[PDB]
Design a binder for these strands. Structure first.
Lengths: 372, 421
RNA sequence: GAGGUGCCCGAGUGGCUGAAGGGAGGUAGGGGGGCCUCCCUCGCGGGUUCGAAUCCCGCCCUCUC
């Protein structure tokens, strides 16, 4: 949400903002109703108000998807002395996955077998241990929550269609732990000394798969239910504060990937590809050998007070001023997507896969062995 | 589902089973509908044998005969259709009845409801506390491991853990998968939703339908046990004898409506909507010899797990009217919860003979080449958050901190759980 | 739009085929009646036609733009 006060006080910033972001809103109709609300007008204005976007940071490329700018890239592709097989053919070759699950649960489902299943639980634990050395508080959470939490983040209303509802219930399956994490402090006045709150939340994750392509979705890439470890920071209301936390989030995600031993790169995301409440978004993408290209594995985002005004997240500033706080989030690691890149990038001559040094602890072995 | 031929020739065994397992079925109406359906099938095979001679003789018949034959082939077709619709309506209704028929319990089971349950063995005892013991949620609040605000976000029978204890929960799930994998079982990670058919195939539908949450607008349901997925993987397939047994250890998040448990376990980790569970599932050849060998192996592994976890437990044989519709035999394992002055359930071992194999159509081909229905059994390996309620209370130290057992110090990397805020 | 056929790959768009041809003489499941004999099943269900693996409809899974 945005502050109604400076909205009517500075409507061009918002018109320009709606422009560069491609939102379907005629700000003039809304601005009409906020005049008439001085009965019905009240609530009609609210549903409209919840669609006003945050103005993008000045360094963002203007344009949709294709204006996204590579910032930098770290690492270089693998040196193969055999044709790289793809992730699905590696899995199939080793008995590491069960195809019969599409018959049980339907499409875009996965079931892992043998060392790939133990690997999957290994990377999740490694991600939570790392966030915990890094000062972020570990939480294990549910995957369901009431409607007001989705409004809180801004997932409702823009993405309602991407969320599964539990029938005969007031609950919805969450697509990410920031939904829950975001709603925890709703309604409290937080003390200034508590700030910043750094949370690393784990939970099962669910999506309807309204966003669908007829391309690499298959295997481990876009499945309905998956595992996520999310980073979440609630901070005081200043850009110097926010920029420092955005920087932290990014180093975290780059460090995990350095430990995991994967080629990656950072992409400034353009205003038309950002989504309504964002101030800034960078994507980290990892190189996928078989596809020959870089695929997203993380999206770092600052939204300032846009969602703190939806979820009522406040603090008490040192003058005794009560202010809305600023929020930020970034993935730490999510399985199984990350496994498609890990398997192609680390395949051996013989189709077995090696384990990055940093995970030999959590796995107990250096090479993932075949099964049946 | 039961062998309909056995049901036809031993109805008294079944009839006793119904009464003694408390099932509400009128086996004499089912037996009657069965006589109807089986007659109407023989009528229709008469009509179809006819259609099959006429349709074969339309070629070869002289353009004279040929036009007579077609008027007849046509009237015979319309009759068979009439007969087919009528047989659809009755078979449908008979299949509803047949999915309620219980498996007769093994002879050594206690006859009676809940209360007839006998404790079989107990290993370890109640702890001797030198100080007042704390309750597991008060222990959680004192070490700052409990996030109470999760109830405004997701509602009741919900929990969230903070700090070392959240890490503890995850270390316990890999501990169990590891134990299972060195015990010869295949580790698998699996989804938590499936189609109706899989619920029907384990016996969770029709009987426990109210226990299961549906995902609105889809043909999908959330499972409360990795058994629903696991059991269904081999439907239709005819497994080779040499593959048997199939021993799987499956991890999956579990969700439960917990409709009906009003006033029961309202605060704490004991009865929540969503939890993590690792399962022991075995599919074996059709001999009681083989089955009883497996039931012993499933009990053993779970016991071994509770010893490493340093916990007092007892096995309890379950009575006929508490085991549920398709079980031959079920033994529960309960662990002692200090705050309640009681043992509380942590695992259930259940042998179900071929009752779920012939709902799911799980068959194998034996050494003689005969195809026959298989045998299935299952038992928990470990389920979170409830063992954490037992581990915290049984291992509290007088200052409020909690000790971690020796078998999990390699996963925590510390010996006493450190408190948060 | 293209597909789904036996252990597996694959031939088969109206009767000839429960089924060609190869590897990883022969190599399916179920149900009636008396080893013989009949009915049903070519992903699941239903339909047109004297007759369907073949044609139509719906559903499920794979592949492509």
């Amino acid at each position: 949400m945005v502050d109604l006060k400076r909205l009517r006080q500075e409507p061009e910033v918002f018109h320009r903002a709606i422009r560069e972001k491609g939102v379907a809103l005629d700000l003039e109709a809304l601005l009409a109703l906020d005049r008439e609300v001085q009965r019905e007008k009240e609530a009609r204005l609210e549903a409209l108000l919840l669609q006003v976007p945050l103005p993008p940071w000045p360094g963002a490329p203007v344009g949709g998807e294709e204006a996204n700018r590579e910032i930098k890239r770290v690492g270089g592709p693998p040196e193969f002395s055999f044709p790289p097989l793809d992730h699905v053919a590696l899995m199939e070759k080793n008995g590491w996955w069960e195809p019969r699950i599409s018959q049980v649960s339907g499409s875009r489902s996965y079931a892992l077998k043998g060392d790939l299943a133990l690997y999957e639980l290994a990377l999740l634990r490694f991600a939570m241990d790392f966030m915990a050395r890094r000062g972020f508080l570990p939480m294990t959470l549910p995957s369901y929550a009431r409607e007001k939490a989705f409004l809180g983040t801004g997932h409702f209303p823009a993405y309602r269609d991407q969320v599964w509802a539990i029938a005969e219930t007031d609950l919805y399956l969450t697509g990410t732990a920031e939904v829950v994490l975001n709603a925890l402090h709703s309604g409290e006045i937080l003390p200034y000394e508590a700030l910043p709150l750094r949370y690393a939340g784990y939970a099962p994750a669910f999506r309807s798969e309204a966003g669908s392509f007829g391309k690499d979705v298959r295997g481990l890439m876009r499945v309905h239910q998956f595992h996520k470890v999310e980073q979440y920071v609630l901070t005081e209301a200043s850009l110097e504060a926010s920029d420092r936390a955005f920087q932290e989030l990014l180093e975290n995600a780059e460090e995990i990937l350095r430990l995991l031993e994967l080629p990656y790169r950072l992409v400034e995301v353009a205003t038309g590809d950002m989504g309504p409440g964002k101030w800034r978004q960078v994507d980290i993408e990892v190189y996928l050998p078989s596809e020959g290209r870089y695929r997203e594995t993380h999206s770092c985002s600052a939204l300032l007070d846009w969602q703190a005004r939806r979820a009522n997240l406040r603090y008490r500033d040192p003058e005794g001023r009560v202010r809305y706080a600023y929020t930020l989030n970034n993935t730490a690691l999510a399985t199984p997507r990350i496994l498609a890149m890990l398997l192609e990038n680390h395949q051996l001559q013989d189709g077995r896969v090696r384990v990055p040094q940093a995970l030999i602890p959590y796995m107990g072995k250096e090479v993932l062995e075949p099964c049946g």
